[PDB]
mmCIF file of N, CA and C in Angstrom:
data_model
loop_
_atom_site.group_PDB
_atom_site.id
_atom_site.type_symbol
_atom_site.label_atom_id
_atom_site.label_comp_id
_atom_site.label_asym_id
_atom_site.label_seq_id
_atom_site.Cartn_x
_atom_site.Cartn_y
_atom_site.Cartn_z
ATOM 1 N N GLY A 1 -3.653 16.084 -9.719
ATOM 2 C CA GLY A 1 -3.351 15.625 -8.343
ATOM 3 C C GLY A 1 -4.134 16.402 -7.306
ATOM 4 N N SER A 2 -4.705 15.692 -6.344
ATOM 5 C CA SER A 2 -5.500 16.313 -5.297
ATOM 6 C C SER A 2 -4.929 15.977 -3.918
ATOM 7 N N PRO A 3 -4.921 16.954 -2.997
ATOM 8 C CA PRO A 3 -4.392 16.757 -1.649
ATOM 9 C C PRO A 3 -5.351 15.984 -0.743
ATOM 10 N N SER A 4 -5.023 14.727 -0.488
ATOM 11 C CA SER A 4 -5.809 13.902 0.417
ATOM 12 C C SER A 4 -5.136 13.839 1.788
ATOM 13 N N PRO A 5 -5.845 14.248 2.853
ATOM 14 C CA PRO A 5 -5.322 14.183 4.220
ATOM 15 C C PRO A 5 -5.219 12.744 4.721
ATOM 16 N N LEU A 6 -4.139 12.079 4.336
ATOM 17 C CA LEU A 6 -3.917 10.686 4.691
ATOM 18 C C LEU A 6 -2.723 10.540 5.630
ATOM 19 N N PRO A 7 -2.613 9.385 6.311
ATOM 20 C CA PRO A 7 -1.420 9.016 7.077
ATOM 21 C C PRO A 7 -0.136 9.145 6.253
ATOM 22 N N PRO A 8 0.998 9.410 6.922
ATOM 23 C CA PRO A 8 2.302 9.569 6.261
ATOM 24 C C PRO A 8 2.693 8.358 5.429
ATOM 25 N N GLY A 9 3.018 8.610 4.173
ATOM 26 C CA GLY A 9 3.426 7.545 3.288
ATOM 27 C C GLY A 9 2.292 7.027 2.432
ATOM 28 N N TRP A 10 1.059 7.307 2.839
ATOM 29 C CA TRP A 10 -0.109 6.837 2.109
ATOM 30 C C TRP A 10 -0.504 7.807 1.002
ATOM 31 N N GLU A 11 -0.946 7.255 -0.116
ATOM 32 C CA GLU A 11 -1.426 8.050 -1.232
ATOM 33 C C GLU A 11 -2.623 7.383 -1.893
ATOM 34 N N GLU A 12 -3.531 8.201 -2.401
ATOM 35 C CA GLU A 12 -4.729 7.715 -3.066
ATOM 36 C C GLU A 12 -4.437 7.478 -4.543
ATOM 37 N N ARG A 13 -4.658 6.256 -5.008
ATOM 38 C CA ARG A 13 -4.328 5.901 -6.379
ATOM 39 C C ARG A 13 -5.470 5.147 -7.034
ATOM 40 N N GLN A 14 -5.365 4.962 -8.332
ATOM 41 C CA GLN A 14 -6.281 4.109 -9.055
ATOM 42 C C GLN A 14 -5.513 3.395 -10.150
ATOM 43 N N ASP A 15 -5.971 2.221 -10.514
ATOM 44 C CA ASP A 15 -5.412 1.522 -11.652
ATOM 45 C C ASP A 15 -6.286 1.771 -12.872
ATOM 46 N N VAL A 16 -5.954 1.129 -13.981
ATOM 47 C CA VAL A 16 -6.703 1.291 -15.220
ATOM 48 C C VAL A 16 -8.149 0.805 -15.061
ATOM 49 N N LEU A 17 -8.382 -0.075 -14.094
ATOM 50 C CA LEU A 17 -9.706 -0.641 -13.895
ATOM 51 C C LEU A 17 -10.632 0.374 -13.235
ATOM 52 N N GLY A 18 -10.078 1.263 -12.415
ATOM 53 C CA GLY A 18 -10.876 2.354 -11.904
ATOM 54 C C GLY A 18 -11.205 2.164 -10.448
ATOM 55 N N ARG A 19 -10.912 0.981 -9.939
ATOM 56 C CA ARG A 19 -11.041 0.734 -8.522
ATOM 57 C C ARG A 19 -9.987 1.557 -7.806
ATOM 58 N N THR A 20 -10.423 2.437 -6.935
ATOM 59 C CA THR A 20 -9.498 3.330 -6.288
ATOM 60 C C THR A 20 -8.780 2.597 -5.167
ATOM 61 N N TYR A 21 -7.518 2.278 -5.398
ATOM 62 C CA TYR A 21 -6.714 1.611 -4.382
ATOM 63 C C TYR A 21 -5.596 2.545 -3.900
ATOM 64 N N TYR A 22 -5.343 2.557 -2.605
ATOM 65 C CA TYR A 22 -4.278 3.376 -2.036
ATOM 66 C C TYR A 22 -3.006 2.561 -1.917
ATOM 67 N N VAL A 23 -1.899 3.240 -1.678
ATOM 68 C CA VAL A 23 -0.620 2.571 -1.493
ATOM 69 C C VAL A 23 0.285 3.370 -0.561
ATOM 70 N N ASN A 24 0.940 2.670 0.354
ATOM 71 C CA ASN A 24 1.910 3.286 1.246
ATOM 72 C C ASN A 24 3.313 3.065 0.693
ATOM 73 N N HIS A 25 4.079 4.137 0.566
ATOM 74 C CA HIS A 25 5.413 4.065 -0.028
ATOM 75 C C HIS A 25 6.389 3.260 0.831
ATOM 76 N N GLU A 26 6.099 3.157 2.123
ATOM 77 C CA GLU A 26 7.015 2.522 3.069
ATOM 78 C C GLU A 26 7.093 1.008 2.842
ATOM 79 N N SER A 27 5.960 0.331 2.958
ATOM 80 C CA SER A 27 5.933 -1.122 2.830
ATOM 81 C C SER A 27 5.314 -1.527 1.496
ATOM 82 N N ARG A 28 4.842 -0.530 0.753
ATOM 83 C CA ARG A 28 4.163 -0.752 -0.524
ATOM 84 C C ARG A 28 2.868 -1.525 -0.312
ATOM 85 N N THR A 29 2.279 -1.327 0.863
ATOM 86 C CA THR A 29 0.990 -1.907 1.193
ATOM 87 C C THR A 29 -0.111 -1.188 0.425
ATOM 88 N N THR A 30 -0.913 -1.945 -0.307
ATOM 89 C CA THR A 30 -2.012 -1.375 -1.065
ATOM 90 C C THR A 30 -3.331 -1.675 -0.370
ATOM 91 N N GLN A 31 -4.269 -0.746 -0.453
ATOM 92 C CA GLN A 31 -5.560 -0.905 0.202
ATOM 93 C C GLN A 31 -6.672 -0.398 -0.705
ATOM 94 N N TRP A 32 -7.780 -1.110 -0.728
ATOM 95 C CA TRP A 32 -8.911 -0.760 -1.575
ATOM 96 C C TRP A 32 -9.745 0.318 -0.894
ATOM 97 N N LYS A 33 -9.607 0.392 0.421
ATOM 98 C CA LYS A 33 -10.343 1.358 1.215
ATOM 99 C C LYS A 33 -9.395 2.405 1.776
ATOM 100 N N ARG A 34 -9.921 3.293 2.604
ATOM 101 C CA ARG A 34 -9.117 4.354 3.187
ATOM 102 C C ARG A 34 -8.421 3.872 4.450
ATOM 103 N N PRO A 35 -7.125 4.165 4.572
ATOM 104 C CA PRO A 35 -6.348 3.809 5.755
ATOM 105 C C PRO A 35 -6.809 4.578 6.982
ATOM 106 N N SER A 36 -7.135 3.847 8.037
ATOM 107 C CA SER A 36 -7.467 4.455 9.311
ATOM 108 C C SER A 36 -6.271 5.269 9.814
ATOM 109 N N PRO A 37 -6.511 6.338 10.588
ATOM 110 C CA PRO A 37 -5.447 7.237 11.050
ATOM 111 C C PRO A 37 -4.593 6.622 12.161
ATOM 112 N N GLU A 38 -4.665 5.306 12.298
ATOM 113 C CA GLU A 38 -3.868 4.601 13.283
ATOM 114 C C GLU A 38 -2.499 4.268 12.692
ATOM 115 N N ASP A 39 -1.672 5.294 12.613
ATOM 116 C CA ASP A 39 -0.308 5.153 12.125
ATOM 117 C C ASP A 39 0.640 5.919 13.037
#
């Protein structure tokens, strides 16, 4: 596990395919790119 400075609730993840997708625990919104700090 590595500390990524992301917006609250957001985490950097990957699936078995290797495409790095993020996910927010709040709404379970997943993103293929990095979440802008507009939170």
